[PDB]
Design an enzyme around this catalytic site. Structure first.
Site, PDB file in Angstrom:
ATOM      1  N   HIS A  41       0.876  -1.448  -0.228  1.00 12.99           N
ATOM      2  CA  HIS A  41       0.339  -0.066   0.046  1.00 12.99           C
ATOM      3  C   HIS A  41       0.800   1.228  -0.193  1.00 12.99           C
ATOM      4  O   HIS A  41       0.423   2.514  -0.123  1.00 12.99           O
ATOM      5  CB  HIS A  41      -1.006  -0.054   1.141  1.00 12.99           C
ATOM      6  N   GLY A 143       3.311   6.588   9.137  1.00 14.03           N
ATOM      7  CA  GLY A 143       4.563   6.676   8.603  1.00 14.03           C
ATOM      8  C   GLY A 143       5.578   5.026   9.140  1.00 14.03           C
ATOM      9  O   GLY A 143       5.988   4.648   9.446  1.00 14.03           O
ATOM     10  N   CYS A 145       4.169   1.991   9.061  1.00 12.88           N
ATOM     11  CA  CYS A 145       4.481   1.024   8.172  1.00 12.88           C
ATOM     12  C   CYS A 145       5.409   0.451   7.425  1.00 12.88           C
ATOM     13  O   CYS A 145       6.093   1.142   7.292  1.00 12.88           O
ATOM     14  CB  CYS A 145       3.193   1.067   6.392  1.00 12.88           C
TER      15      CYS A 145
END
Ligand code: R6Q
Ligand code: R6Q
Lengths: 306, 306
Positions: A41, A143, A145
């Site tokens: 993503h 942020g 991830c």
């Protein structure tokens, strides 16, 4: 001599964290040999995240659209592919700090350390368990991830988790390093709810053994029980059923303390029925379930790593 | 988005840990530039530890009696001296992995990460607070002496603790990196008992702010109080007195949440008087006091380090 929620030393993983940017989205990647692993993503806008078609979104991305930065130095992307929910970005430079490593898919109840990162930079380290409902209870802001979870056995890092999603309830969902989510979760911003967060019974028992080794024994009673009798009470309290496999794994702790596993089950049963009456065990007023039997042995023995 | 007991990334400190052996005693040392810092009781036998005369015991030791090993490689000792309760061993090689660093003497209530080590090798990392009675509640077995506590601000490691002693009660005592013990403790195997382990009130309040930011707010009430009125209840519950300095430090958390510090004090007061009634806050059934206001801000913001 004390018993603490303890993470693995994080240095070997710190040397693998990079920043990955695509468009306006920046998150973390894991650089091992000449491949950078990150959540797919990264290619989405916040618009895209409601109903992404990842294959279609990827058509519009070239190697040069993935900005990979290791500290202050830029890495050259020479290939990219999608594997399940992760992207693999091939770079032209092998990470000189690559540790010995494995990718492992863990089972519910197993514990690991998380190195929370923002923009490729480490923020902190803490210990987590894969819950029986396949969430984890972490500390993740936007942020983070691409932060990873891992275990170390001497010199070898076993990566087991990469962070992808926060559910509307504030718990966390993610993948193994082949990109397959734990549990039923998907990388879309939609209605996905966690199932029952049950307690990891074998871990609670391990922690009770740890308490006895460390002087907290007020909860030991004069009773015993059977697997089936204990399991009736576990079900009532949303505890995982205890199996003979679990009993076997507790065997070394049973032997060192001289407390039969089913005797400790009877102590646990009385704790569940009567509560703590305002007392504590190893500094907790709850029964802790994020130490595995192997964690307890390790910490109570002093096992170390490269 | 979750709130976890979180340690600093440990890599910068891992690269500083060595093994130090004198006679039959092996523990850990800290290698920074060309100096190795370790507890002076490395020179003692278990006999010696009942009433050591450290100056006299040191007369019989030469540079070549201190065996310093960094991983698999031996370091050459070219000088040694005693500073308070630590030895400083000068070696002929500057540690190539020396981070930017400072030695800091912390105050009770302040938190830090511990890298527990055995034989110079990292075992795990966890977060600790300097208790108001100048002990810490760690996880330390024989051979862990010389493990250090530290904080990181971006690229600079502030070393604040070195581990020396376990008290008969299972709590821990140690020095700063100039070798001065925290509190009244000495490096002798004798009768030293800890004083009252009071709760760090400003840290509990910070953690209540963290809970509100993360969705746990059932404990917010309709009341307020004053510093003096709250402090009467704190004393009754063996909580540290809250000062105006503490209120000021909570100022940024107050501003972001819109909950006046004294309003949160009134919530805390009701929690102390009524208990939790079986509820939890951020996954605890106790009031947590090992997060500082700065810790909460940091974790709730995502601040990072080199
Ligand atoms: O520091 C120290 N001094 C010390 C001083 C007095 C008594 C005991 C000790 C020990 C020595 C090793 N002893 C390990 C025994 C052990 C515990 C658990 C397991 C296991 F069940 F996990 F497998 C195996 C062995 C722990 C305490 O340690
Ligand atoms: O991840 C995300 N997405 C997100 C999504 C929706 C709402 C809020 C967010 C935030 C954005 C930054 N927001 C920081 C606000 C803040 C909190 C505490 C302090 C302080 F008191 F500690 F100083 C200062 C600022 C935390 C949550 O984060």
């Amino acid at each position: 001599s004390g018993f603490r929620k303890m993470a693995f030393p994080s240095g070997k993983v710190e040397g693998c964290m990079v920043q990955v940017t695509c468009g306006t989205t920046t998150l973390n990647g894991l650089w091992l040999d000449d491949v950078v692993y990150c959540p797919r993503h990264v290619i989405c806008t916040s618009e895209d995240m409601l109903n992404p078609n990842y294959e279609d979104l990827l058509i519009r991305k070239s190697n040069h659209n993935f900005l990979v930065q290791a500290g202050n130095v830029q890495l050259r992307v020479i290939g990219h592919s999608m594997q399940n929910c992760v992207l693999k970005l091939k770079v032209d430079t092998a990470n000189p700090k690559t540790p010995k490593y494995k990718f492992v898919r863990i089972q519910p109840g197993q514990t690991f350390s998380v190195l929370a990162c923002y923009n490729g930079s480490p923020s902190g380290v803490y210990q987590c368990a894969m819950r029986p409902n396949f969430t984890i209870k972490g500390s993740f802001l936007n942020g983070s991830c691409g932060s990873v979870g891992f275990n170390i056995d001497y010199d070898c890092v076993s990566f087991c988790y990469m962070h992808h999603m926060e559910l509307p309830t504030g718990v966390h969902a993610g993948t193994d390093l082949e990109g397959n989510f734990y549990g039923p979760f998907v990388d879309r911003q939609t209605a996905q709810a966690a199932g029952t967060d049950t307690t990891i019974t074998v871990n609670v028992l391990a922690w009770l053994y740890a308490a006895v080794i460390n002087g907290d024994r007020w909860f030991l009673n004069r009773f015993t029980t059977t697997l089936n009798d204990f399991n009736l009470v576990a079900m009532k309290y949303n505890y995982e059923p205890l199996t003979q496999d679990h009993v076997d794994i507790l065997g070394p702790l049973s032997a060192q303390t001289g407390i039969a596993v089913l005797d400790m089950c009877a102590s646990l049963k009385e704790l569940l029925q009567n509560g703590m009456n305002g007392r504590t065990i190893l500094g907790s007023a709850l029964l802790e379930d994020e130490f595995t039997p192997f964690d307890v042995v390790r910490q109570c023995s002093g096992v170390t790593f490269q």
